[PDB]
Amino acid sequence: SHMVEAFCATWKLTNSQNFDEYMKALGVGFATRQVGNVTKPTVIISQEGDKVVIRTLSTFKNTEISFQLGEEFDETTADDRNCKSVVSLDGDKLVHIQKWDGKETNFVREIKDGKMVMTLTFGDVVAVRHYEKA
Ligand SMILES: O=C(O)[C@H]1[C@H](c2ccccc2)[C@H](C(=O)Oc2cccc3ccccc23)[C@H]1c1ccccc1
């Protein structure tokens, strides 16, 4: 996929806005939130066949998801939520939906001026994270 290629790279977190409140709305407790706030992840996005693969490396733990665009799959998040998830293209954007325990959250990945911007929404709580190619 052409639009996915813009995301395919090794990325490092450079800025985060309101992620603590976002985690709080998800139900993450204070201490685990501290882990989420201090960790600096390395995020590798790639295309392998018809699958998109997102590998995240950090001291806390490493995660890996592999999916076909628009196909629902089971996802265990870094905070151990067991979700039904789907990642789809919306124009040039990647939209990731996570459903668990009757709840729903979504986040959007965009390439803007060569950087990756992730906007996360749960209810009316919004967080924004910036990443740059490593
Ligand atoms: O930035 C990313 O893409 C990923 C980071 C990461 C992953 C694995 C290990 C450590 C960090 C974010 C993140 O902080 O995860 C959480 C870590 C700890 C607790 C968390 C609680 C709730 C939610 C995330 C947590 C990962 C990420 C992926 C997709 C959307 C937002 C954040």
Side-chain angles (χ1 to χ4, degrees):
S1 169
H2 162 70
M3 290 89 91
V4 176
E5 291 172 25
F7 300 89
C8 289
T10 300
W11 302 91
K12 194 87 188 297
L13 181 72
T14 59
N15 196 36
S16 185
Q17 302 167 208
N18 208 37
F19 192 54
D20 183 65
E21 281 298 302
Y22 172 82
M23 287 186 290
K24 185 169 178 187
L26 288 180
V28 184
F30 175 85
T32 302
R33 287 208 311 277
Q34 302 202 258
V35 175
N37 290 321
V38 68
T39 301
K40 294 290 243 62
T42 299
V43 184
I44 306 172
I45 302 175
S46 63
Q47 290 186 94
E48 306 182 4
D50 49 35
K51 278 166 160 274
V52 178
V53 185
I54 304 183
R55 302 173 174 88
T56 306
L57 303 310
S58 79
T59 321
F60 179 47
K61 65 173 66 171
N62 305 330
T63 62
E64 179 177 313
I65 58 172
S66 176
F67 50 86
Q68 302 189 90
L69 292 171
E71 175 187 77
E72 188 175 82
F73 63 101
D74 295 332
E75 175 181 18
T76 301
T77 64
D79 60 314
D80 274 330
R81 285 173 292 121
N82 295 281
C83 306
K84 297 285 176 166
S85 296
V86 65
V87 183
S88 306
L89 275 171
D90 178 20
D92 297 330
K93 296 187 171 71
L94 281 176
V95 183
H96 192 151
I97 307 165
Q98 296 177 338
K99 300 184 159 96
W100 79 105
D101 295 341
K103 302 191 232 186
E104 178 175 341
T105 189
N106 80 87
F107 41 93
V108 182
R109 296 173 185 274
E110 311 172 66
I111 304 305
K112 294 284 150 251
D113 297 339
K115 296 179 177 189
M116 179 168 60
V117 188
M118 175 189 290
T119 303
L120 308 99
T121 301
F122 187 72
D124 57 17
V125 179
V126 177
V128 181
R129 290 161 73 78
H130 288 77
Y131 306 77
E132 296 179 10
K133 296 191 189 189

Short mmCIF file of all heavy atoms in Angstrom, two decimals, residues 73-105:
data_model
loop_
_atom_site.label_atom_id
_atom_site.label_comp_id
_atom_site.label_asym_id
_atom_site.label_seq_id
_atom_site.Cartn_x
_atom_site.Cartn_y
_atom_site.Cartn_z
N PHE A 73 -8.98 -7.93 14.69
CA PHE A 73 -8.04 -8.89 15.26
C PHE A 73 -8.02 -8.72 16.77
O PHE A 73 -8.43 -7.69 17.31
CB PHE A 73 -6.63 -8.72 14.69
CG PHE A 73 -6.00 -7.39 14.99
CD1 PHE A 73 -5.06 -7.27 16.00
CD2 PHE A 73 -6.33 -6.26 14.25
CE1 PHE A 73 -4.47 -6.04 16.28
CE2 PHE A 73 -5.75 -5.03 14.53
CZ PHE A 73 -4.81 -4.93 15.54
N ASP A 74 -7.53 -9.76 17.46
CA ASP A 74 -7.36 -9.71 18.91
C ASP A 74 -6.04 -9.03 19.24
O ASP A 74 -5.00 -9.35 18.66
CB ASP A 74 -7.39 -11.11 19.50
CG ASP A 74 -8.73 -11.80 19.33
OD1 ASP A 74 -9.75 -11.09 19.26
OD2 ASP A 74 -8.76 -13.04 19.25
N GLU A 75 -6.07 -8.08 20.18
CA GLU A 75 -4.89 -7.32 20.56
C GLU A 75 -4.78 -7.27 22.08
O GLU A 75 -5.75 -6.92 22.76
CB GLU A 75 -4.95 -5.89 20.01
CG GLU A 75 -3.79 -5.00 20.46
CD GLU A 75 -3.88 -3.59 19.92
OE1 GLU A 75 -4.97 -3.17 19.48
OE2 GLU A 75 -2.85 -2.89 19.95
N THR A 76 -3.60 -7.59 22.61
CA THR A 76 -3.31 -7.39 24.02
C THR A 76 -2.38 -6.19 24.15
O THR A 76 -1.22 -6.25 23.72
CB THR A 76 -2.69 -8.64 24.65
OG1 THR A 76 -3.60 -9.74 24.50
CG2 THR A 76 -2.43 -8.42 26.12
N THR A 77 -2.89 -5.11 24.74
CA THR A 77 -2.17 -3.85 24.78
C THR A 77 -1.05 -3.91 25.82
O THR A 77 -0.95 -4.85 26.61
CB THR A 77 -3.13 -2.70 25.11
OG1 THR A 77 -3.66 -2.89 26.43
CG2 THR A 77 -4.28 -2.64 24.11
N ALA A 78 -0.20 -2.88 25.80
CA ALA A 78 0.91 -2.82 26.75
C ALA A 78 0.41 -2.84 28.19
O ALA A 78 1.12 -3.33 29.08
CB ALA A 78 1.75 -1.57 26.49
N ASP A 79 -0.78 -2.31 28.44
CA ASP A 79 -1.36 -2.33 29.77
C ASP A 79 -2.29 -3.52 29.99
O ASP A 79 -3.06 -3.52 30.96
CB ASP A 79 -2.10 -1.01 30.05
CG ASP A 79 -3.22 -0.74 29.06
OD1 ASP A 79 -3.01 -0.90 27.84
OD2 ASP A 79 -4.33 -0.37 29.52
N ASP A 80 -2.23 -4.53 29.13
CA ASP A 80 -2.91 -5.81 29.33
C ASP A 80 -4.43 -5.67 29.25
O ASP A 80 -5.16 -6.38 29.95
CB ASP A 80 -2.50 -6.47 30.65
CG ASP A 80 -1.25 -7.31 30.52
OD1 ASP A 80 -1.00 -7.87 29.43
OD2 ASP A 80 -0.51 -7.44 31.52
N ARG A 81 -4.92 -4.78 28.40
CA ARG A 81 -6.32 -4.82 28.00
C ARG A 81 -6.44 -5.81 26.84
O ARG A 81 -5.66 -5.76 25.89
CB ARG A 81 -6.82 -3.44 27.58
CG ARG A 81 -7.08 -2.50 28.73
CD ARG A 81 -7.40 -1.09 28.24
NE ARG A 81 -6.23 -0.47 27.61
CZ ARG A 81 -6.17 -0.03 26.36
NH1 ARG A 81 -7.22 -0.11 25.55
NH2 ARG A 81 -5.05 0.51 25.91
N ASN A 82 -7.43 -6.69 26.92
CA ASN A 82 -7.67 -7.68 25.87
C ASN A 82 -8.77 -7.14 24.98
O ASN A 82 -9.95 -7.16 25.35
CB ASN A 82 -8.03 -9.03 26.48
CG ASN A 82 -6.89 -9.62 27.29
OD1 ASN A 82 -5.95 -10.18 26.74
ND2 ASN A 82 -6.98 -9.50 28.61
N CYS A 83 -8.38 -6.68 23.79
CA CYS A 83 -9.23 -5.89 22.93
C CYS A 83 -9.54 -6.60 21.62
O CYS A 83 -8.77 -7.44 21.15
CB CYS A 83 -8.57 -4.55 22.59
SG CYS A 83 -8.06 -3.59 24.01
N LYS A 84 -10.67 -6.21 21.04
CA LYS A 84 -10.97 -6.42 19.64
C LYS A 84 -10.61 -5.12 18.93
O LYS A 84 -11.18 -4.06 19.24
CB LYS A 84 -12.44 -6.77 19.43
CG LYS A 84 -12.86 -8.08 20.07
CD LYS A 84 -12.35 -9.28 19.29
CE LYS A 84 -12.70 -10.58 20.00
NZ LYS A 84 -12.51 -11.77 19.11
N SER A 85 -9.67 -5.18 17.99
CA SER A 85 -9.09 -3.99 17.40
C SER A 85 -9.19 -4.05 15.89
O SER A 85 -9.25 -5.13 15.29
CB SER A 85 -7.61 -3.84 17.81
OG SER A 85 -7.48 -3.64 19.20
N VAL A 86 -9.21 -2.88 15.26
CA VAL A 86 -9.14 -2.81 13.80
C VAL A 86 -8.34 -1.56 13.43
O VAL A 86 -8.49 -0.51 14.05
CB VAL A 86 -10.54 -2.80 13.16
CG1 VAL A 86 -11.32 -1.56 13.55
CG2 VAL A 86 -10.43 -2.93 11.63
N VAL A 87 -7.46 -1.70 12.45
CA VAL A 87 -6.70 -0.58 11.91
C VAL A 87 -7.05 -0.43 10.44
O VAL A 87 -6.94 -1.39 9.68
CB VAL A 87 -5.18 -0.78 12.10
CG1 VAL A 87 -4.41 0.44 11.61
CG2 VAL A 87 -4.86 -1.07 13.56
N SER A 88 -7.45 0.78 10.04
CA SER A 88 -7.91 1.03 8.69
C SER A 88 -7.30 2.32 8.16
O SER A 88 -6.86 3.18 8.93
CB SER A 88 -9.44 1.13 8.63
OG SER A 88 -10.05 -0.01 9.21
N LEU A 89 -7.30 2.46 6.84
CA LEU A 89 -6.90 3.71 6.20
C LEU A 89 -8.09 4.64 6.08
O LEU A 89 -9.19 4.22 5.69
CB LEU A 89 -6.30 3.46 4.82
CG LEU A 89 -4.81 3.12 4.76
CD1 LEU A 89 -4.43 2.69 3.35
CD2 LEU A 89 -3.95 4.31 5.20
N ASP A 90 -7.89 5.91 6.44
CA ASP A 90 -8.82 6.99 6.17
C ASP A 90 -8.01 8.02 5.37
O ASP A 90 -7.31 8.85 5.95
CB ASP A 90 -9.39 7.59 7.45
CG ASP A 90 -10.33 8.75 7.18
OD1 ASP A 90 -10.83 8.85 6.04
OD2 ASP A 90 -10.57 9.55 8.10
N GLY A 91 -8.08 7.92 4.05
CA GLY A 91 -7.23 8.73 3.20
C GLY A 91 -5.77 8.38 3.42
O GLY A 91 -5.34 7.28 3.08
N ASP A 92 -5.01 9.32 3.97
CA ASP A 92 -3.60 9.09 4.28
C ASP A 92 -3.38 8.78 5.76
O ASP A 92 -2.22 8.67 6.18
CB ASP A 92 -2.78 10.31 3.89
CG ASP A 92 -2.81 10.58 2.40
OD1 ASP A 92 -2.94 9.60 1.63
OD2 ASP A 92 -2.69 11.76 2.00
N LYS A 93 -4.44 8.61 6.53
CA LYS A 93 -4.34 8.42 7.97
C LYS A 93 -4.61 6.97 8.35
O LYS A 93 -5.33 6.25 7.65
CB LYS A 93 -5.31 9.32 8.72
CG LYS A 93 -5.01 10.78 8.55
CD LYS A 93 -5.88 11.61 9.42
CE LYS A 93 -5.42 13.13 9.42
NZ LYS A 93 -5.63 14.04 8.20
N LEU A 94 -3.99 6.53 9.44
CA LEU A 94 -4.25 5.21 10.00
C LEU A 94 -5.11 5.35 11.25
O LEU A 94 -4.71 6.00 12.21
CB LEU A 94 -2.94 4.49 10.32
CG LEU A 94 -2.21 3.84 9.14
CD1 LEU A 94 -0.89 3.26 9.60
CD2 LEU A 94 -3.05 2.77 8.47
N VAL A 95 -6.29 4.72 11.23
CA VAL A 95 -7.24 4.82 12.33
C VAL A 95 -7.29 3.47 13.03
O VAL A 95 -7.60 2.45 12.41
CB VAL A 95 -8.63 5.25 11.83
CG1 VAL A 95 -9.59 5.41 13.00
CG2 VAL A 95 -8.53 6.54 11.04
N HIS A 96 -7.02 3.48 14.33
CA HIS A 96 -6.91 2.28 15.16
C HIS A 96 -8.00 2.33 16.21
O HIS A 96 -8.03 3.25 17.04
CB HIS A 96 -5.52 2.23 15.80
CG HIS A 96 -5.18 0.92 16.44
ND1 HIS A 96 -3.89 0.47 16.55
CD2 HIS A 96 -5.96 -0.02 17.03
CE1 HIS A 96 -3.88 -0.70 17.17
NE2 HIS A 96 -5.12 -1.02 17.47
N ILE A 97 -8.89 1.34 16.18
CA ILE A 97 -10.01 1.25 17.11
C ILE A 97 -9.75 0.07 18.05
O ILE A 97 -9.40 -1.02 17.58
CB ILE A 97 -11.35 1.04 16.37
CG1 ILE A 97 -11.56 2.12 15.31
CG2 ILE A 97 -12.50 1.05 17.37
CD1 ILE A 97 -12.67 1.77 14.32
N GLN A 98 -9.91 0.31 19.35
CA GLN A 98 -9.78 -0.73 20.37
C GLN A 98 -11.08 -0.82 21.17
O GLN A 98 -11.54 0.20 21.71
CB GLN A 98 -8.61 -0.45 21.31
CG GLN A 98 -7.25 -0.47 20.63
CD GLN A 98 -6.13 -0.12 21.59
OE1 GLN A 98 -6.36 0.51 22.62
NE2 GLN A 98 -4.91 -0.53 21.25
N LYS A 99 -11.65 -2.02 21.25
CA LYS A 99 -12.86 -2.28 22.02
C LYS A 99 -12.56 -3.30 23.10
O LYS A 99 -11.95 -4.34 22.83
CB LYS A 99 -13.99 -2.81 21.14
CG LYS A 99 -14.42 -1.89 20.01
CD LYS A 99 -15.62 -2.48 19.28
CE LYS A 99 -16.41 -1.45 18.50
NZ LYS A 99 -15.98 -1.45 17.07
N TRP A 100 -12.98 -3.02 24.33
CA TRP A 100 -12.79 -3.95 25.43
C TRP A 100 -13.75 -3.61 26.56
O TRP A 100 -13.89 -2.44 26.92
CB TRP A 100 -11.34 -3.92 25.95
CG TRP A 100 -11.10 -2.75 26.84
CD1 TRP A 100 -10.98 -2.76 28.19
CD2 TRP A 100 -10.97 -1.39 26.43
NE1 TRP A 100 -10.77 -1.49 28.66
CE2 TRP A 100 -10.77 -0.62 27.59
CE3 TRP A 100 -11.00 -0.74 25.19
CZ2 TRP A 100 -10.59 0.76 27.56
CZ3 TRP A 100 -10.84 0.63 25.16
CH2 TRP A 100 -10.64 1.36 26.33
N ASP A 101 -14.39 -4.63 27.12
CA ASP A 101 -15.27 -4.46 28.28
C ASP A 101 -16.36 -3.43 28.01
O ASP A 101 -16.69 -2.59 28.86
CB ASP A 101 -14.47 -4.07 29.53
CG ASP A 101 -13.53 -5.16 29.98
OD1 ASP A 101 -13.73 -6.33 29.58
OD2 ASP A 101 -12.58 -4.85 30.74
N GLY A 102 -16.94 -3.49 26.81
CA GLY A 102 -17.97 -2.54 26.43
C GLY A 102 -17.50 -1.12 26.22
O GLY A 102 -18.32 -0.24 25.98
N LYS A 103 -16.19 -0.89 26.26
CA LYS A 103 -15.61 0.43 26.06
C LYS A 103 -14.92 0.47 24.70
O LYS A 103 -14.58 -0.56 24.11
CB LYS A 103 -14.58 0.78 27.14
CG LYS A 103 -15.08 0.77 28.57
CD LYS A 103 -14.03 1.39 29.49
CE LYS A 103 -13.68 0.52 30.68
NZ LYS A 103 -12.77 1.25 31.60
N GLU A 104 -14.68 1.70 24.23
CA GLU A 104 -14.10 1.93 22.92
C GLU A 104 -13.19 3.14 22.99
O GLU A 104 -13.54 4.16 23.58
CB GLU A 104 -15.19 2.16 21.86
CG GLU A 104 -14.65 2.46 20.48
CD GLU A 104 -15.74 2.56 19.44
OE1 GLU A 104 -16.86 2.06 19.70
OE2 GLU A 104 -15.49 3.14 18.36
N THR A 105 -12.02 3.01 22.37
CA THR A 105 -11.10 4.13 22.22
C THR A 105 -10.56 4.08 20.80
O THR A 105 -10.62 3.04 20.13
CB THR A 105 -9.96 4.08 23.24
OG1 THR A 105 -9.21 5.30 23.19
CG2 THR A 105 -9.03 2.90 22.95
#
